Design a protein around this ligand. Structure first.
Ligand SMILES: *[C@@H]1O[C@H](CO)[C@@H](O)[C@H](O)[C@H]1NC(C)=O
Lengths: 51, 51
């Protein structure tokens, strides 16, 4: 004779946007080091990288 | 002015010869040869460049 129902409840209708992509951008700093050496051989004849 | 550290592209010294002479002339200009060569006291514009 009868059956149950299905209720739909709506509370808020806000203006949002989609999600094209998702990522994380961290904070970075400046860190560096060097070393002072001498030629003393044929490894530093003219330049550091040959080609 | 030895090699292994000094860099030159091309056409910095000329060669001339008539009969087994092979005389070489100079093409290098000194520092006081280009235009807009200022000195220690400089007042170009509103800035007064001192030392
Ligand atoms: C010297 O300076 C003037 C004015 O700034 C400029 O017009 C001229 O091209 C400069 N000379 C050179 C060789 O750059």
């Amino acid at each position: 004779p009868d059956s149950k129902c299905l209720k739909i409840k709506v509370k808020r209708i806000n203006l949002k946007c989609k999600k094209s992509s998702s990522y994380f951008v961290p904070d970075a700093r400046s860190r560096c080091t060097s070393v002072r050496r001498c030629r003393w051989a044929g490894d530093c004849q003219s330049g550091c990288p040959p080609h | 002015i030895k090699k292994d550290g000094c860099i030159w592209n091309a056409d910095l010294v000329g060669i001339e010869l008539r009969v087994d002479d092979a005389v070489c002339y100079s093409k290098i200009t000194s520092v006081e040869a280009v235009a807009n060569y200022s000195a220690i006291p400089t007042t170009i514009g509103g800035l007064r460049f001192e030392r």
